[PDB]
Amino acid sequence: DPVASAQIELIKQRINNIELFQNNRQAADSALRLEEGILSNAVNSLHRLREIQIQAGNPSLSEEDRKTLAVEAQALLNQLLDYANTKSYMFSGSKSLTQPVSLNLSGQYVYNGDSTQRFQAVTTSLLVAVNDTGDNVFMRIPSGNGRFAIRETLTPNTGTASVSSGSVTNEAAFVPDNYTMTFALNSQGNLVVMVSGTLSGNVIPPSGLPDDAPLYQEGSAIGFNGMEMVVSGLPKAGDSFSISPAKNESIFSTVQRMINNLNKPYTSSVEKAATQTENNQLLAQIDSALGHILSVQSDLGARLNQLETAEKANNDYLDISAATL
Template sequence: MRISTSQMFNQSINSVLDKQTSTSKILDQLSSGKRVNTAGDDPVAAVGIDNLNQQNALVDQFMKNIDYAKNRLGLSESKLGTAETLVASTREQVIRAINGGLSSSERQMIADELRGTLEELLAVANTKDESGNYIFGGNETGKQPFAFDNAGNIVYSGDSGARDSIIASGVVVETNIAGDKAFMNAPSGLGDYSANYLASQVGDFSVDSAKITNPATYVEDTYTFTMVGANLEVRDSSSALVTTEVGFDPANPVSFNGMEVKLDGLPEAGDSFSIAPQSEVSILDTINQAIALIEDPNKVNTPQGVSELAQILNNIDSGVNQISIARSETGNSLKSLESYSTQHVEEKVVNSSTLSMLEDLDYASAITEFEKQQLALNAVSSVFSKVGSVSLFDYI
């Protein structure tokens, strides 16, 4: 078989170019430290590498979301802890103020202390994060959530919204506690109602609880209780008689219209009080009520004042419990974040190990292969140089 000069030349050139390409590929691998730089290097491994890189990118995003959630929940947990301490201290201040041996000036000092505590609590409830957003405003992070209205009551301008953060596939965690959940909507200390006592009260008694026991027969209304001799009459808002407890014994609850009311102590004949629906109370308003009670000389240490005090203390206890529950929720969320963070770190370690197996270069093998390709390239180049310089005239 005869081979033309041009065919021989092309074959030699192709051989040189092939060896140069192989050498260049190994040089790229040595430079990058990766065995697979393009899908063409190893199509099967390239698919696995792409999937692992996507998983790692997703894990990185989850970790960023977790860091964000940790910062928000950590700040909320800290502030709720401060609020819990402040509210718990108000109970002691209120009890100290209702002391018959205190002068009016001493009681005023305690009222001023309570007012300072209330201002501190309000400042906590209006806490901003590092971006200037109110952390207890729900989704209304741009405006102050708590403020006094014209009547001196504290109103909430936020909402009940929760801001979610995705921390794992299909796993969402709330990164905030809404202000109404933490400070406004504590269960009433009496149950489902609040009590209103009169200045004419003589007996040493208070409402211990007022709860709905049978929703099917429950009739919502404002009810008035009056002690008529030894009997306790209950009337609705239209003054219609609902029930009469003959020979009333405070050891037994009063049941009517699907609800149950229990008294602590026995009213005197002629004593009257009313209850109105109120299933939730605000700890901020409760402290306001305590201040008003302490500053009112016509109520302090009177039967009416003592009864109102009992209700205030119950509501303070409920407020402390509400804040504690909110704080506990943030603590549980932080614990969950730590758990998922650990899982993500472990997942990334496994992914990175697998990636290393698929794409990292074995330098010893690569250098050996590089030397072989260099030797082959030099040999092909040398042969091509010699063959290319051969002429028929050298043999004539």
């Protein structure tokens, strides 16, 4: 059977393609599996940091005991740096010999790599990303709740007010701006809430005028332009907060903020409320980090699943080739 011969040869040639891509398959497999192990170490570090942030938000924790948690925080920051600078550097893209994350003289951590992914050919027609890049994994994560950030203004607050991380509850109505939220005394002497924005002008109330503004209610939801957030405690006329859109920000920066927030004073009721708005932000930012690394793990696991699915196709072709021959 010149057909039988033809088959024999096609099996010869497909079998050789399988052998010729082994080094690569093994190569792609080790690299990915090794990355997973590092990413999972980062998740372990992040979880430990989350537990610190939850602990740090408890009002009945000493100032001294709170400060000492800052030391562990640093240990975990270092862990993350280590993982990010794992070695040829894993998370630096095409700049193999360049240390991806380093600390500049301003005090901010910066990324020295580039954003190029390497793709390994594991079959004639299949290409699989073999690495991730430091900018994507550790550096570009959204601040605040993921959509907007809340920080205390330059004029420091004198009350015990603090804000939750909030959320965008109505996307249709969402409007990005740099909002300022201020509390003021009414004409009748009561505490009222006001909100305005650079681009949007006066939001709550449109009037701008205190007498038109809604009374402050502790633990109540204040909402405007698609957003919604809860102020707690007793603010003082004059106190204010900035609500801004979310910056990209590295896991590292988040932990630095943690270290700084842990070192703030924490015995007086006013002092504690100062830390709280920020406590709520950092919890979000850790969860954003946690979620974010998970998505990189998920995509890494997808890339594995491309490669295992190819190996199955192989093992099935041998089983069928056997059957013929």
